[PDB]
Ligand binder design. Structure first.
Ligand SMILES: [Cl-]
Ligand code: NA
Length: 129
């Protein structure tokens, strides 16, 4: 599923991301935009052989199991494929664990490089929330 901006803002809000560990909703929408262009089915491979999955590009090296990342961890206890669902629940729940691990949203490179320090509220402007 390719989410619209406000559609996604509302789904994330419903799933408890607004102000989760101090990150306003705009932060999450912005990250999703630049990580996956709002596409739940996004996948990208990394040099180390790991793969990033879903709307928030969660990495198989530590968070999910894809059966092809030797030596990896599965800290969200889920198959990576679950992160590709049109239902963002698994992605959100795992993201909550990631953002809570000490490094905040810096775990998401696109967030750090394209959202951090910007006017992220612009991403939810005009949306009915
Ligand atoms: Cl933080
Ligand atoms: Na893994």
């Amino acid at each position: 599923k390719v989410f619209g901006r406000c559609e996604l803002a509302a789904a994330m809000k419903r799933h408890g991301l607004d102000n989760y560990r101090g990150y306003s909703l705009g932060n999450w929408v912005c990250a999703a935009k630049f990580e996956s262009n709002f596409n739940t089915q996004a996948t990208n491979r990394n040099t180390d052989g790991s793969t990033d999955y879903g709307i928030l590009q969660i990495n198989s090296r530590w968070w999910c199991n894809d059966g092809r990342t030797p030596g990896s961890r599965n800290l969200c206890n889920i198959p990576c494929s679950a992160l590709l669902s049109s239902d963002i629940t698994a992605s959100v729940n795992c993201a909550k664990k990631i953002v809570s691990d000490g490094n905040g949203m810096n775990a998401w490179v696109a967030w750090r490089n394209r959202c951090k320090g910007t006017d992220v509220q612009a991403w939810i402007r005009g949306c009915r929330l």
